[PDB]
Amino acid sequence: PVNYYVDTAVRHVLLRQGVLGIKVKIMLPWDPTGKIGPKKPLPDHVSIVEPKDEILPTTPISEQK
Amino acid sequence: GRVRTKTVKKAARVIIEKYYTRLGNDFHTNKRVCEEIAIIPSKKLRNKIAGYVTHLMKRIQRGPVRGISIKLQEEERERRDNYVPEVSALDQEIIEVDPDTKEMLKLLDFGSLSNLQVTQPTVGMNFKTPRG
Amino acid sequence: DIKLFGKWSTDDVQINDISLQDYIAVKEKYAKYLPHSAGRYAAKRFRKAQCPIVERLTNSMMMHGRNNGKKLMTVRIVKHAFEIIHLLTGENPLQVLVNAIINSGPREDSTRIGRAGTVRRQAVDVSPLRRVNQAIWLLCTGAREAAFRNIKTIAECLADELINAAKGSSNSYAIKKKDELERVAKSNR
Amino acid sequence: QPIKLARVTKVLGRTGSQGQCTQVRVEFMDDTSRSIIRNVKGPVREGDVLTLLESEREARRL
Amino acid sequence: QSVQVFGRKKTATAVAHCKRGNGLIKVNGRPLEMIEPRTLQYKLLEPVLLLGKERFAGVDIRVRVKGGGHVAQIYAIRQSISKALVAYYQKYVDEASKKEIKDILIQYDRTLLVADPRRCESKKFGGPGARARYQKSY
Amino acid sequence: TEQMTLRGTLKGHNGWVTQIATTPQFPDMILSASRDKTIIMWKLTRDETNYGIPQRALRGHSHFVSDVVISSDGQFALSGSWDGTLRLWDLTTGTTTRRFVGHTKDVLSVAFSSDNRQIVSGSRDKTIKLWNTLGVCKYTVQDESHSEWVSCVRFSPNSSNPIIVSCGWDKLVKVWNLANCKLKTNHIGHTGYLNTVTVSPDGSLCASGGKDGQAMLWDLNEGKHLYTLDGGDIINALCFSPNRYWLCAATGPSIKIWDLEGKIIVDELKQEVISTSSKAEPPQCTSLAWSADGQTLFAGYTDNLVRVWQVTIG
RNA sequence: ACGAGACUCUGGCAUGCUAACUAGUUACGCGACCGGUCGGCGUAACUUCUUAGAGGGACAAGUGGCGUU
């Protein structure tokens, strides 16, 4: 994934004795993918989901649809 | 060189502590239950997790796990914790008591109890380890 | 079907190894015919034991820069003088081959021991695998260096080295180097 | 020097200034009533028969 | 549709199409025992005296070969022949002597049923070959 | 009654078995779909040198075939693999004829129509398909279906109109008449994931059970309770006797057989060679069934073998 | 938390599925002595090969042993 989390721009600012050369790098946000960040979940992190609560059956309760 | 990374170990921990009720024992079903309960974004990873989880379930079917204790294990332990013998280990007919603790009991006037039996002290005071 | 090449009987072969046969297995179905099955056993500990002696010696005689990679000529050159010892002994050449090989392994080796003492090292017995491998390599080295600018012709000299080592006389390169090494080690005990 | 034979019982360790020898416990089949510890050389197997020349020549320990 | 399990040694692949026949075998428009180097002649001979002629009298086998090297073509032709024989003689007639012949195969050489997995290793820069690096200047 | 004992087992397997289809019309023909990616057929030779070995084995699978079921004719086989498809092997030319795949995930358990025209298949995507060779679409379950995995689906093999039951890991069961395939009954009550339910060939009752070990019968046409089968956890087999009044389930590695006559035990089964330090459980049985004649019991295991249980002869 | 790892590709993976004579694909009287080799020719064969998109497989889960188990 590290192939697609870098943005880079370059500029320079002027002193008389020398130039200050400014490279700007930014890491890309996975969370605001905007369809560019990978839709797929992060490889290492096993994206788990919150379990759902329900009543543990004690007496049979039957519904008709 | 088959030491499990903390990522797969932690995945097994969170799976068996959060979604244990849905997992099965078979590896070949285990990666399927893994992909049902959570999302593994790779294949090698899901076999990693499935293999370790089979290891944990084999370990629990063997017996206790030193570092792992879940609510289900808590209730099964409290089921296994309630072992009550028919006869109390404390209620006995004759118990030995030194003369000094007989004096201690008599100071409270409970020396009249019949279950106490005198045991004479040891011959000498040979109770210290040699110095050196 | 159960004999080597359809010519070398493997049923009434000699024991000849008491317990070194665990290293070299040429007395059962674990004995392939031709000394060529590709170098596929050199991928795990002790798979060399499965490999037949013939293939190992055929692979070995292909070194010294002038024999880098070319192996079919090695197979030809071993089958030649395999036939020579076979017809000079009249029986299955296995006994004479094994005799030559086991007479060449250096009985003991002077390994350098000690913190900084190089004036006295230890004479220790050599493992059968190291012994046989060194014996094969050193006799092949002698065969090669008896073939460059030498009136003898290669693919015939190794037959005489084999029969000489099987008998044990000191004319051979392999047993004489082994004996000089042995005497050096005996000095070192 | 006559050569006697030994059999490995359990591999003990690997020794050597650069590492060439194996310390292993051995038993004699001809005696059958005693076991010693030999620092043999080379790739020794588990149970292979070891050709020792003497019963009193031992090298350094550790 | 079809198995045609073929045979590969290194990069050299040989496939043996086997069908109902007289038992004779052809290798690339040619019978067997006329190989030019004729040093691996017994290597191609192997299967016939391993399993026996009584099993090689009812099947026509055609072998096609392609892949570099003298020896590399071999160790695959015989593997292809063996595995084609297993496939054909299993899918139709019986399974007991099938176990017998495959067991004989296994005890002689496991390579005759299952192929060699290991292949060439790619070369990385900075040296002549794959693992070897160039001489360091000093 | 039968004393259901084992004489000697036969090896030669390379993976577990998933379904055993024994047919009564053919005396020696039997299908077995095994999750080693194969189908196999044995002929009952009944010899002492070998207790019976297969005559032909077929391998064309892409993954571990989940369930199998025979058609009317024996020259063709239909198998649904763990890749989620369905395929029709032919036993004459040794090559396939039809390949019915519409799903994306594995078809966990297949079932067949009573009249050899409907293909049903329930996958892990909470989707059940049921189509025909003719092309008239019958049903695909899309909306307001099971909330989680559906592990099986079976027919009612009676001479009346079939009704299907759909059971899954989400603890709830559903029943649909295939004549309409409309929502009529959803049944609640299990304490675990459903994997193997068993319907009698009558279409009036159907035992529902799974990993829970708390099995309750759910009738196909009425939907009530009949019995409360309990025992050890993790049960993946249930089957009655069509020709008699027995019943048997595979509760874990062990096997529990009772009566549909009185629900009492006929013979407790326990076989093991005693070993000093052996900390592994005996071989595990996954599926149970009857012979083509009922005198012998088929027990499909997870240990690459199907145990045939016969009478002790004495 | 970064790094290690997982991750990507790569030989093992069509033993089943996406299917072009332009590269290859047993069937099809001729040519050859009269029944067996030409890659020059003919079921537009419903792709096993080397041509590849999906899917699958292996995980120290199997066993034995060692380990403060």
Nearest to E41 by CA among E77, E69, E83, E10: E77
Gap between the Cα atoms of B96 and B109, Å rounded = 18
Query: CA-based Rg of chain D, rounded to a whole angstrom?
Result: 11
E114 alpha carbon, distance to own chain's centre: 9
Gap between the Cα atoms of C118 and C120, Å rounded = 6
Contact, F312 vs F3, CB < 8 A?
Answer: yes
Greatest Cα-to-Cα distance within chain A, rounded to the nearest angstrom:
87
Q: Is B115 helix (H, G, I), strand (E, B) or coil?
A: coil
Other C-beta atoms closer than 10 Å to the C-beta of F102 total: 15
Residues with Cβ within 8 Å of C54's Cβ and at least 6 positions away in sequence, in order, are C26, C35, C78, C97
Going by their DSSP bridges, the two strands F76-80 and F86-90 should be labelled as: antiparallel
Q: How many Å from the CA of E3 to C1' of G52?
A: 18
Size (chain A), residues? 65
C141 alpha carbon, distance to own chain's centre: 11
| DSSP state at residue E134 | P
Tokens of B99: 């003369």
Interface of A with F in 35-64 (CB under 8 A): 54, 56-57, 60-64
In a domain, F129, yes or no: yes
- Break sites following residues in chain F (C–N > 2.5 A): none
Domain that holds residue B49: 1-61
Gap between the Cα atoms of F170 and F151, Å rounded = 9
Other C-beta atoms closer than 10 Å to the C-beta of C68 total: 8
Among the partner residues B25, B28, B62, nearest to F279 by beta-carbon distance: B62
Nearest to F76 by CA among F53, F100, F54: F100
Nearest CA in chain F to A59: F189
CB contact under 8 A, E39 and C72: yes
Q: How far apart are the first and last CA of chain D?
A: 27
Closest nucleotide (C1' vs CA) to E15 is: G49
Q: Which helix (H) or strand (E) holds C58?
A: helix C53-60
Q: How far apart are the first and last CA of chain E?
A: 63
Q: Which residues of C3-23 are buried (b: 16+ CB within 10 A; e: fewer)?
A: ebeeebebeebeebbebbeeb
Q: How many Å from the CA of F89 to C1' of G19?
A: 21
CB contact under 8 A, F12 and E94: no
Contact, F2 vs F271, CB < 8 A?
Answer: no
Residues of F within 8 A of A65 (CB-CB) are: 183-186
CB contact under 8 A, C29 and E107: yes
Contact, F294 vs F244, CB < 8 A?
Answer: yes
Closest nucleotide (C1' vs CA) to F82 is: G56
Residues of C within 8 A of D21 (CB-CB) are: 111, 124
Following DSSP, what letter does each residue of chain A receive, concatenated?
-GGGSEEEEEEEEE-SS-EEEEEEEEEPPSSS-TTTS-SSPPSSS-EE------PPPSS---EE-
Q: Where are the alpha helices (DSSP H) in E1-138?
A: 41-51, 70-73, 77-91, 96-108
In a domain, F2, yes or no: no
Contact, C95 vs C14, CB < 8 A?
Answer: yes
Tokens of C15: 């024991």
Contact, C81 vs C155, CB < 8 A?
Answer: yes
Q: Is B10 helix (H, G, I), strand (E, B) or coil?
A: helix
* Dihedral (Cα; C3, C9, C15, C20), 10-degree rounding: -50
Residues with Cβ within 8 Å of D17's Cβ and at least 6 positions away in sequence, in order, are C112, C113, C114
Gap between the Cα atoms of F197 and F238, Å rounded = 6
At position E111, the amino acid (one-letter code) is T
Residue with tokens 């994206």: A47
Question: Which CATH number is E102's domain given?
Answer: 3.30.230.10
Residues with Cβ within 8 Å of B32's Cβ and at least 6 positions away in sequence, in order, are F106, F124
Contact, C22 vs D48, CB < 8 A?
Answer: yes
Nearest to F53 by CA among F3, F14, F7, F10: F10
Greatest Cα-to-Cα distance within chain D, rounded to the nearest angstrom:
35
Tokens of B114: 């019949």
Contact, B52 vs B12, CB < 8 A?
Answer: yes
Q: Phi and psi of D49, rounded to 5°?
A: -85, 130
Other C-beta atoms closer than 10 Å to the C-beta of E16 total: 29
Q: Phi and psi of C71, rounded to 5°?
A: -115, -30
| ∠ Cα B66 B69 B74 (to 5°) | 125
| ∠ Cα C98 C100 C104 (to 5°) | 115
Residues with Cβ within 8 Å of F64's Cβ and at least 6 positions away in sequence, in order, are B28, F15, F18, F35, F36, F37, F81, F82
Contact, F255 vs F232, CB < 8 A?
Answer: no
How many domains would you assign to chain F?
A: 1
Nearest to C30 by CA among C48, C16, C43: C48
Touching subunits of A (3+ CB pairs, under 8 Å) are B, F
Q: Is E55 helix (H, G, I), strand (E, B) or coil?
A: helix
Gap between the Cα atoms of F2 and C111, Å rounded = 75
How many domains would you assign to chain E?
A: 1
On the CB side of A60, CA atoms within 13 Å amount to 18
Gap between the Cα atoms of C137 and C139, Å rounded = 6
F279 alpha carbon, distance to own chain's centre: 30
Tokens of F197: 């339910």
Q: Phi and psi of E6, rounded to 5°?
A: 50, -165
Gap between the Cα atoms of C63 and E55, Å rounded = 43
Other C-beta atoms closer than 10 Å to the C-beta of E6 total: 17
* Dihedral (Cα; F58, F62, F63, F68), 10-degree rounding: -50
Contact, F188 vs F219, CB < 8 A?
Answer: no
Question: CA B103 → CA B107, B123, C165, distances in Å?
Answer: 6, 20, 97
Gap between the Cα atoms of F6 and F271, Å rounded = 9
Nearest to B97 by CA among B117, B114, B122, B113: B117
Gap between the Cα atoms of F150 and F303, Å rounded = 25
Following DSSP, what letter does each residue of F123-182 receive, concatenated?
ETTTEEEEEESS----EE--SS--SS-EEEEE---SSS--EEEEEETTS-EEEEETTT--
Gap between the Cα atoms of F66 and C149, Å rounded = 74
Touching subunits of E (3+ CB pairs, under 8 Å) are C, F
Tokens of C125: 């017995």
Contact, C105 vs C135, CB < 8 A?
Answer: yes
Residues of E within 8 A of F53 (CB-CB) are: 95-96
Q: Which residues of B72-93 are buried (b: 16+ CB within 10 A; e: fewer)?
A: eeeeeeeeeeeeeeeeeeeeee
| DSSP state at residue B5 | P
Homologous superfamily of domain range C4-187: Ribosomal protein S7/S5 (1.10.455.10)
Residues of C within 8 A of D39 (CB-CB) are: 124
Gap between the Cα atoms of C174 and D36, Å rounded = 34
Greatest Cα-to-Cα distance within chain B, rounded to the nearest angstrom:
78
Among the partner residues F53, F56, F96, nearest to E96 by beta-carbon distance: F53
F65 alpha carbon, distance to own chain's centre: 12
Q: Does F211 reach chain B within 8 Å, measured CB to CB?
A: yes
Contact, E1 vs E40, CB < 8 A?
Answer: no
Q: Does C73 reach chain E within 8 Å, measured CB to CB?
A: no
Nearest to B16 by CA among B43, B52, B45: B52
Q: Is C179 helix (H, G, I), strand (E, B) or coil?
A: helix
Q: Which helix (H) or strand (E) holds C82?
A: helix C72-89
Contact, B52 vs B8, CB < 8 A?
Answer: yes
Following DSSP, what letter does each residue of F213-258 receive, concatenated?
S-EEE--SSS-----EE--SS-EEEEEE-TTSSEEEEEETTS-EEE
| ∠ Cα F290 F294 F299 (to 5°) | 25
Nearest CA in chain B to A45: B7
Q: How many Å from the CA of F39 to C1' of G13?
A: 21
Residue with tokens 């090689």: E56
Residues with Cβ within 8 Å of E137's Cβ and at least 6 positions away in sequence, in order, are none
Question: CA D29 → CA D38, D57, F112, distances in Å?
Answer: 15, 19, 69
CB contact under 8 A, E99 and F12: yes
Burial grade of E134 (CB within 10 A; 0-12, 13-18, 19 or more):
exposed
Closest nucleotide (C1' vs CA) to F105 is: G55
Q: Does C76 reach chain E within 8 Å, measured CB to CB?
A: yes
Q: Phi and psi of B13, rounded to 5°?
A: -65, -50
Tokens of C28: 């059962």
Q: How far apart are the first and last CA of chain F?
A: 13
Question: Which CATH number is B24's domain given?
Answer: 1.10.60.20
Residues with Cβ within 8 Å of B48's Cβ and at least 6 positions away in sequence, in order, are B4, B8
Domain that holds residue E116: 1-138
The two counts, helices (H) then strands (E), for chain E are 4, 4
Nearest to F215 by CA among F283, F176, F263: F263
Contact, C160 vs C143, CB < 8 A?
Answer: no
Protein CB footprint (7 Å) on chain G nucleotides: 3-8, 10-13, 15-18, 26, 36-39, 47-50, 54-65
E–C contact: 3+ Cβ pairs < 8 A: yes
Tokens of C7: 């010519």
At position F19, the amino acid (one-letter code) is Q
Nearest CA in chain F to E88: F94
Residue with tokens 């099995």: F215
The two counts, helices (H) then strands (E), for chain D are 0, 4
Q: Is E30 helix (H, G, I), strand (E, B) or coil?
A: coil
Ordered by start, the domain boundaries in chain C are 4-187
Question: CA F219 → CA A57, E80, F105, F153, F266, distances in Å?
Answer: 19, 57, 29, 14, 27
Binning chain D into helix, strand and coil, the percentages to the nearest 5 are: 0, 50, 50
Domain that holds residue F30: 7-314
Tokens of F5: 């004992």
Among the partner residues C20, C108, C113, nearest to D17 by beta-carbon distance: C113
Nearest CA in chain F to E90: F56
Nearest CA in chain C to E118: C40
On the CB side of E22, CA atoms within 13 Å amount to 3
Residues of C within 8 A of E108 (CB-CB) are: 29, 32
CB contact under 8 A, E70 and C5: no
Gap between the Cα atoms of F237 and F252, Å rounded = 9
Q: Where are the alpha helices (DSSP H) in D1-62?
A: none
Contact, F144 vs F154, CB < 8 A?
Answer: no
The two counts, helices (H) then strands (E), for chain C are 6, 2
Other C-beta atoms closer than 10 Å to the C-beta of F266 total: 13
Q: Which helix (H) or strand (E) holds B38?
A: strand B38-39
Residue with tokens 């590290």: A2
Residues of D within 8 A of C185 (CB-CB) are: none
Size (chain B), residues? 132
Question: CA C90 → CA B89, C2, C4, C8, distances in Å?
Answer: 89, 21, 16, 12
Query: CA-based Rg of chain F, rounded to a whole angstrom?
Result: 19
Following DSSP, what letter does each residue of F275-306 receive, concatenated?
-SS--SPPPPEEEEEE-SSSSSEEEEESSS-E
Resolution of the entry in angstroms: 2.9
Nearest to C182 by CA among C108, C125, C111: C108
Tokens of A19: 């130039």
C77 alpha carbon, distance to own chain's centre: 15
Residues of A within 8 A of F145 (CB-CB) are: none
Among the partner residues A56, A61, A65, nearest to F184 by beta-carbon distance: A65
Question: Which CATH number is F130's domain given?
Answer: 2.130.10.10
Residue with tokens 């299952």: E114
Gap between the Cα atoms of F234 and F194, Å rounded = 10
Q: How many Å from the CA of A44 to C1' of G1?
A: 14
Gap between the Cα atoms of B2 and F102, Å rounded = 40
Q: Which helix (H) or strand (E) holds E18?
A: strand E12-20
Nearest to F33 by CA among F12, F9, F58: F58
